[PDB]
Design a protein around this nucleic acid. Structure first.
Lengths: 303, 308, 82, 93, 107, 98, 152, 218, 82, 98, 107, 93
DNA sequence: ATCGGATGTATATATCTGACACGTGCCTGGAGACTAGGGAGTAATCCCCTTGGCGGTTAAAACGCGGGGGACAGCGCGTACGTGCGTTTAAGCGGTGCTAGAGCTGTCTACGACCAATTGAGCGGCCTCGGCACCGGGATTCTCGA
DNA sequence: TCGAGAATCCCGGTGCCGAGGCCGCTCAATTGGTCGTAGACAGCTCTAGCACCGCTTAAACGCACGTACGCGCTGTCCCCCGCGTTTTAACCGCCAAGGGGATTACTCCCTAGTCTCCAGGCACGTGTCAGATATATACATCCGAT
């Protein structure tokens, strides 16, 4: 079981933080918020690297490039924006989403972008020209989370209408639709590291790991509190296999991956722990809370 | 099952390595690179229509053949003519080498296929068995390790791509004792099964390992024999599925599409196009979408699951 | 030994010969293949029915009396074959 | 295989009507097929009418009636008269 | 007891024995009348006489001794009642009786 | 100067000699191949009598010249000397062949 | 053949019909390709159970607050689609149905197939007669002029 | 003629089983394969009080037998209580089933229950008729007081692969010591002799003029 | 009681009614009597053949089953009369 | 001002209602008298079933509407809406009625 | 002496015994196949089912419970196979199926 | 005088297909006549074939063959199946 | 191309009913059981027709090639035909009444059925030879430009 | 329109095999009893047909009249006929293998035929609603002015 202890507390976003992500090299931590600002920080010392502005409205998601060189920022201004992380330059501004863009993710080869917006349509974007290559009426409700598989052949999409839909990338083909006998608003979704499973959070204090080849939920995770906000979930792999997530009770929940049992509860945040990020290499977890906290906390364990 | 109005004079198309883009030639001699749902690029390739188009493995290069016997390599990002060559006996086909984009084989009309390189403007003339075929189609295998050449007289030579040495040989039969014009040789992007379209309107599916172990001048039987036993229809163009377990044939006689399997070989299905359209070109999405070019118009044929 | 396309083995000169026998002066092209089709369709029945007889006859060769009884059943009876 | 026909009686009645005439064996076979045709015709019609009459006995009245049903006008009349004369002759002894 | 054919007592040419044989073997009735084969065979002989006579007429008109099917077809399409009897019948080596239409003629 | 008979005239004489002739007007082997092709549709590898196939071709050609004949007649009622496919179709229609 | 027809129906069902927002109520089955009369529209596929086990399931769902999706095959069998079913769980009812339910026997097993009472055209919402017995009341909004105002 | 019955003792009559109903005379157990079915005994009660048992030899979870009584008109393919002429118990929890209606006015059932069945019909409920259920002789209680007219017979309904068997009195395990109730075998040979006399009287009627029976009461 | 000329008893309105049933718009006069003739000719057969049946039936009245078997033998069979 | 429908229109509706109707279109008694007149030709003083004569008239009218039908068709091939006797004659010709 | 008719033994309706007696009295063959009546009657059952089914289709298409011969004509004229089966057959009170030719419509 | 028919059987199969739909006596007798006609069709055809086989016995194979001759395509196919069913159901007696 | 008016047609309603679904008692065809023969089925044998191929020929098919001939489109007119309204007329209902003739039963008898004994009319098979088919050549007659 | 030329008719002569005639060699035709029975026939009904006659009326015949398709004529295009040439494969003749077709001889499973009994079918009554019919109504569609 992990023993994550607070090592660095990070803050500075004037408004509610919406996403924090570790750089794939583990060198930086990108924090987006509704303040139209992004903040790069040092991933090991909590050293504030810089602030990147340019978005016109609140930012609902930000995602790193695989080479740790680019960052896509999906903002409430209906725009994406691709930035060079080293220069902070707005290399591209992606226009075409008809409403608030909530999520964004790069392809495993970092040359393509998937984007979900309030328009309830998922847009598929070029990187080097920033051109929208596809647009899909994916869901009947604003999209919450979109993500690539291990290779970029499949795109998983979640939305408030409770649907988790796997789509073909080359054709936009709606491959699969996962249903759990009800309509639980799915606020987050992502593939497994092996691309074999899918972790999806529903707004009923429940996380669900599904098999893709089976199309059925394999494991369930409860004990946390998440019913309104887009609370992120990550796979803790650098140490033991765990499932880390935020919760509306100001806690940072860590379940065992296999046994689904809570293996740690990181407390110290005063607001809802809105965003989570797991270090790609180290046993480091960045937990960012909402506006009543406005703080990001680094946690380091020994296993 | 879905067409595109934004392109005209569709003559030949080719999927990229991942089935994300489609470079189609037009009668004006232009390349229209269309994305799977708008055009991504327009290249002024030739004044002459383009009849042969192939993507590079990295996808950054496309080899194009005009009807002016003008072959040219183009960068997909820029659209520049990287290299340009011309020959006698107008080119029937070009084909990048799948594991070396510097190399490209070319099947001309009356002359033997020749393998050139882009780094050095050299060329290696591949041998011809009967010395009088004047019409030999040729193709790399899935890995570009061997070259399969089929003549108008049913003779089939398997050479090694580096030495052009005869590593296998056999003549296909019309059943009784006669030869048939080898219309085309296709391979599977996965595995080792390949197909031959012949003048007998009968597609013959083999496994290249069996030809290699059959040796020179042997009697290798096909993995499968495929035809329209009902209409006895020729096949203008055929292709495998992306996986290699489904095979499609284009009946330009009645502008239809036949779909068989590989192992069993039973006909999966049939797709009917506009009875007034003349079927020209056929391709399959490499990773269940099928592009068709008929009367200058492209149509798309997808296949969805039980959901949506 | 799989057969095919003997329908076009019917020569247009043969067709026009039959037409002249029928007392026809001017003919169009569109007829012949059409004609052929009909021909096929026509025989399409009898042989089958004929071999149907041969079906019940439990034999491998097909005989005239087969088509005799067919044309009879087809109301187009013929003489001179038993 | 003993096969039965009528071409001998064809030649007979030919000489009875035309003594100085020959026939193609083809034509003989055609005529014999015609004989068979008319025979099956008349027999089927007679059996059918007897069925309508629920009769299990096909007699000369049936014969004449069915011929009249089949042959037209003077053909039928002459045929009826001929059959009548012939059955009269046979019944005379 | 010398055996004479019943057709002799009928004074006819076609074998009434073979007739009655085909009759019993024809599955038409449980028992055939005595004079019924006689009558029908007489009809058969008469109609054969008619058709052969017409054929001989045609052949001699064509200056022909051996009578080919063409003569018979012509006579068939020349006798209206016989035609009516046989219009539903097809004729090998029959061809078509010469029939010329009015508007077909030149001017 | 070269001579050419007026149209139809040669075909007219052809009509005359064909009503004169009685033999077949179809080449044997093509017809036979067609018959066997049709046969394999219902069952493959079936044998035939030469007499049988001769009967087939004769009876066919008879039906065919009858069709040509009454279609000629209809075209007379169509006031044309050229034939039209619709004539054949409607003839079959009256022939109950539809 | 009913087996051949059933194979054809199970092959074409996924692309013949769809489910959309319905003016009748919520979501419902709409026609995506013109359906001829009497032809197989859709199987109400699900869990084939005996009748005696219905109540134990029903009360079970009654304990779970999950609606019962059960159709009586006959006096002995029932297709329960509550937990496991197909799109046929979204066929609304109309007093004027263009469809009708019939039980077929394929290889010994019974299948409840909704066939088309008439030639159904693309876009039409699919509805049949549930034939629900008269209770003491579910208002109907099928829109038919003959509507009983109540399924029961 | 005669109604001779192919039975050494009063057993489950093979004449009144469904074609999907299997028997094993090693224990005369009854089993099925698909859904429910019904079998009945050889005898049938018309008056008096009597008693029998059912011994259960196999009850998996997907195996639920039902045991009780049923009058004629009882469709032997139905699960013994689907109509108003049958009254049984469901062998998952002791639940009285009649008119397909389940009632929990009953005790609990066990997988290895040797269940005793007591029933009294008199010589519009039949007056003073009742049914009592016992678990190994221990009174499980009254099942049905309202009993319609018409003869009844003990019956067993099978679900998928249920193994149960009926059993008479002389080999009993927990029998009641009543001097009036009769085992299965006793009423069995009573009805057998009665039908013998029925054959006697019918052959008398058709064969010899006249009939005559004693002072009616018995 | 010797009958005659009931053929013209067929009214031209009746003929045109039948024609309209056959789906005919414009008609000429020359047809009707011609029509009538055909009619006669047509029935010319059946009744005779019918009474021929009645001939063998040895009866004075003529029945439907007569024309039934006639139309049968005339290949124009009809239903609804036994 | 008096109104008169354009030609055919009324007859067109007549066609429509006659294809709609199914009963006879011939007066019974005239047909019966015609039948008996025909009968006395072959034999005089012969009786009939009303069912028999009903069958006669129905079957006749059926043959007659069939003739009218295919003669209409032929006249279509004759490109006319008016009927011509030759159409009927040649129809019978194709019907083998000549 | 338990009785069970061959129709029940085939679980069908048409009387196997009656049709057997009929074909026996029909004088077609000396002996018969005992299952031939069953087979033929089953065929009759099938074809009758189809034709009456189409008839009822037209009937309730016309809100008609009791089927009229016009329904029969329409049914037999609609189906290609049955029409081919009964092309030269006529039907009492049949009438003609709706059919208007192209050029009949005014332009 | 007893006159046999099949109105009972046609009504039976009517109910078996359409318990709701009624029937007219005119169309009833039409059905009866029709089935009589088609039964005579098959009878004559099978007898003709067996005579060609010169086999005095008439069996079910003849029936299958001759109905195949009679029915237009798929009908026969469907037909023969149930027919087979029948005899199977009867051979399994 | 539209609108207004005329008219014709699909509808709801009410009731009448007579076909029609339904149930009976009584009859006999169908089922059930038993016996025989022998049609049918199987198998080994023979034959022998067919299906296959091979080479040479050319008459025949393919194809091309004007080009006059008619399919066809259009265009004038006019006569014949729909139509709506007159008129008069047999058609139909219906109900009456007689019986001629279907339509039924009961004989009794001639009449094939059938079998057995007998065989010669007829049929497969074998010469044979003469109208007939083919050919070449001469004379006749249609036809297309004067 | 009188010739040139071309396709044809006819004549004599050649050679052939099918038409025919005759020959062994039966089995199927005849003959003669013998028997059960199909129907021939007589003799009854009764009913359906046949005719009578009256009453109502939808229907039929004819008129007038617009009008519009049928028809007749012209000019065009194209296209199919006719002829020339080139290619081919049907044919034809021969050979050969076998695989099926036909045959015969056993063998016996199935059906015909018989007899028994009754139960489903059939004639026959019996209420009774599907739909026929009529009416007023609301909708569709043509035809002419605009």
């Amino acid at each position: 079981k992990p023993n994550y202890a607070l090592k660095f507390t990070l803050a500075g976003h004037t408004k509610a933080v919406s996403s924090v992500k570790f750089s794939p090299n583990g060198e930086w931590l990108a924090s987006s918020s509704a303040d139209k600002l992004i903040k790069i920080w040092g991933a090991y010392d909590g050293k504030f690297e810089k602030t990147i502005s340019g978005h016109k409205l609140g930012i609902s998601d930000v995602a790193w490039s695989s080479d740790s060189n680019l960052l896509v920022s999906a903002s409430d201004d209906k725009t994406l924006k691709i930035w060079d992380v080293s220069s902070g330059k707005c290399l591209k501004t992606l226009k075409g989403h008809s409403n608030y863009v909530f999520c964004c993710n790069f392809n495993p080869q970092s040359n393509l972008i998937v984007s979900g917006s309030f328009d309830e349509s998922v847009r598929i974007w070029d990187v080097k020209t920033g051109k929208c290559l596809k647009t899909l009426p994916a869901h009947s409700d604003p999209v919450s989370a979109v993500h690539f598989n291990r290779d970029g052949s499949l795109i998983v999409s979640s939305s408030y209408d409770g649907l988790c839909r796997i789509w073909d990338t080359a054709s936009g083909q709606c491959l699969k639709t996962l249903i759990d006998d009800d309509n639980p608003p799915v606020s987050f979704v992502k593939f497994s590291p092996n691309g074999k499973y899918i972790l999806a959070a529903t707004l009923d204090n429940t996380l669900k790991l599904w098999d893709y080849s089976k199309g059925k939920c394999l494991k369930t995770y409860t004990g946390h509190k998440n019913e309104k906000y887009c609370i992120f979930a990550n796979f803790s792999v650098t140490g033991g296999k765990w499932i880390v997530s935020g919760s509306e009770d100001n806690l940072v929940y860590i379940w065992n991956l296999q046994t689904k049992e809570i293996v740690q509860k990181l407390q110290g945040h005063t607001d809802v722990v809105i965003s989570t990020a797991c270090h790609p290499t180290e046993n480091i977890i960045a937990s960012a809370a909402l506006e009543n906290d406005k703080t990001i906390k680094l946690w380091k364990s020994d296993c | 099952d879905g067409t595109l109005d934004c392109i005209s004079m569709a003559l030949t198309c080719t999927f990229n390595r991942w089935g994300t883009l489609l470079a189609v030639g037009c009668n004006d001699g232009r390349i229209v690179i269309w994305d799977f749902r708008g055009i991504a690029k327009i290249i002024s390739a030739h004044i002459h229509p383009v009849c042969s188009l192939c993507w590079s493995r990295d996808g950054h290069k496309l080899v194009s053949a005009s009807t002016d016997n003008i072959v040219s390599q183009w960068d997909v990002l820029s659209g520049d003519c990287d290299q340009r060559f011309r020959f006698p006996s107008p080119i029937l086909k070009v084909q990048y080498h799948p594991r070396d984009q510097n190399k490209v084989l070319v099947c001309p009309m009356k002359s033997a296929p020749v393998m050139l390189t882009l780094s050095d403007s050299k060329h290696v003339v591949l041998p011809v068995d009967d010395d009088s075929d004047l019409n030999v189609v040729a193709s790399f295998d899935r890995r570009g390790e061997y070259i399969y050449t089929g003549n108008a007289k049913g003779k089939i030579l398997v050479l090694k791509t580096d030495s052009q040495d005869l590593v296998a040989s056999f003549r296909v039969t019309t059943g009784t004792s006669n030869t048939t014009a080898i219309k085309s040789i296709e391979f599977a992007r996965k595995g080792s099964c390949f197909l031959i379209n012949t003048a007998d309107r009968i597609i013959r599916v083999y496994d290249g390992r069996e030809i290699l172990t059959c040796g020179r001048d042997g009697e290798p039987e096909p993995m499968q024999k495929l035809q329209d036993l009902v209409n006895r229809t020729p096949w203008k163009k055929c292709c495998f599925s992306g996986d290699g377990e489904y095979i499609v044939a284009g009946s330009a006689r009645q502008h239809a599409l036949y779909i068989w399997e590989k192992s069993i070989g039973n006909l999966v299905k049939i797709l009917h196009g506009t009875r007034g359209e003349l079927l020209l070109d056929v391709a399959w999405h490499p990773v269940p979408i099928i592009a068709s070019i008929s009367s200058g118009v492209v149509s798309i044929w997808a296949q969805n699951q039980v959901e949506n | 030994k799989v057969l095919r396309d003997n329908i076009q083995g019917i020569t247009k000169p043969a067709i026009r010969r039959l037409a002249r026998r029928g007392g026809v002066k001017r003919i169009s092209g569109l007829i012949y293949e059409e004609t052929r089709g009909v021909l096929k369709v026509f025989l399409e029945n009898v042989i089958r029915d004929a071999v149907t007889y041969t079906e019940h006859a439990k034999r491998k060769t097909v005989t005239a009396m087969d088509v005799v009884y067919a044309l009879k059943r087809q109301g187009r009876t013929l003489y001179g074959f038993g | 295989t003993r096969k039965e026909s009528y071409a001998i009686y064809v030649y007979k009645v030919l000489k009875q009507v035309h003594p100085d005439t020959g026939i193609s064996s083809k034509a003989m076979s055609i005529m014999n097929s015609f004989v068979n045709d008319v025979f099956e015709r008349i027999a089927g019609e007679a059996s059918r009418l007897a069925h309508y009459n629920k009769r299990s006995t096909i007699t000369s009245r049936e014969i004449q009636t069915a011929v009249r049903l089949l042959l037209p006008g003077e053909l039928a009349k002459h045929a009826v008269s001929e059959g009548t004369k012939a059955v009269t002759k046979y019944t005379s002894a | 007891a010398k055996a004479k054919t019943r057709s002799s007592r009928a004074g006819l040419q076609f074998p009434v024995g073979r007739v009655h044989r085909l009759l019993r073997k024809g599955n038409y009735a449980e028992r055939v009348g005595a004079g019924a084969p006689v009558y029908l065979a007489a009809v058969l002989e008469y109609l054969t006489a008619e058709i052969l006579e017409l054929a001989g007429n045609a052949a001699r008109d064509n200056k022909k001794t051996r009578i080919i099917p063409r003569h018979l077809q012509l006579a068939v399409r020349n006798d209206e009642e016989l035609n009516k009897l046989l219009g539903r019948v097809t004729i090998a080596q029959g061809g078509v009786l010469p029939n010329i239409q009015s508007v077909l003629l030149p001017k | 100067k070269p001579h050419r008979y007026r149209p139809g005239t040669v075909a007219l004489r052809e009509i005359r000699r064909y009503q004169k002739s009685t033999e077949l007007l179809i080449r044997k082997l093509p017809f036979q191949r067609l018959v066997r092709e049709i046969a394999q549709d219902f069952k493959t590898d079936l044998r035939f009598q030469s007499s049988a196939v001769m009967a087939l071709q004769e009876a066919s050609e008879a039906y065919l010249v009858a069709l040509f004949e009454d279609t000629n007649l209809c075209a007379i009622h169509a006031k044309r000397v050229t034939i039209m496919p619709k004539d054949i179709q409607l003839a079959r229609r009256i022939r109950g062949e539809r | 053949p009913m087996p051949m027809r059933f194979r054809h129906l199970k092959k074409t069902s996924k692309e013949a019909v769809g489910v959309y927002r319905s003016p009748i109520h919520g979501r419902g089955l709409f026609c995506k390709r013109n359906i001829d009369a009497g032809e197989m529209v859709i199987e109400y596929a699900g869990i084939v159970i005996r009748s005696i086990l219905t109540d134990k399931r029903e009360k079970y769902y009654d304990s779970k607050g999950i609606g019962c999706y059960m159709f009586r095959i006959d006096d002995s069998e029932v297709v329960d689609a509550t937990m496991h079913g197909n799109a046929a769980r979204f066929i609304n009812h109309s007093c004027e149905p263009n469809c009708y339910s019939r039980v077929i026997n394929i290889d010994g097993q019974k299948h409840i197939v909704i066939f088309a009472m008439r030639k159904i055209y693309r876009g039409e919402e699919l509805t049949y007669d549930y034939k629900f017995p008269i209770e003491d009341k579910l208002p109907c909004n099928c829109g038919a002029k003959k509507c009983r105002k109540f399924l029961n | 003629l005669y109604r001779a019955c192919l039975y050494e003792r009063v057993l489950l009559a093979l004449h009144d089983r469904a074609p999907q109903l299997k028997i094993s005379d090693d224990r005369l157990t009854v089993v099925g394969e698909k859904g429910y079915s019904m079998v009945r005994a050889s005898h049938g009660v018309r008056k008096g009080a009597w008693y029998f048992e059912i011994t259960v030899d196999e009850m998996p979870p997907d195996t639920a037998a039902r045991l009780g009584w049923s009058q004629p008109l009882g469709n032997l393919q139905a699960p013994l209580g689907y109509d108003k002429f049958s009254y049984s118990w469901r062998s998952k929890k002791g639940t009285k089933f009649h008119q397909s209606i389940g009632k929990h006015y009953s005790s609990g059932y066990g997988q290895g229950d040797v269940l005793g069945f007591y029933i009294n019909l008199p010589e519009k409920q039949t007056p003073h008729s009742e049914i009592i259920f016992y678990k190994n002789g221990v009174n499980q209680g009254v099942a049905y007081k309202d009993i319609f007219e018409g003869v009844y017979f003990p019956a067993i309904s099978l679900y998928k692969s249920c193994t149960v068997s009926i059993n008479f009195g002389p080999c009993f395990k927990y029998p009641p010591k009543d001097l009036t109730y009769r085992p299965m075998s006793d009423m069995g040979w009573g009805a057998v002799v009665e039908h013998t006399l029925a054959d006697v009287l019918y052959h008398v009627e058709t064969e010899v003029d006249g009939r005559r029976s004693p002072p009616w009461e018995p």
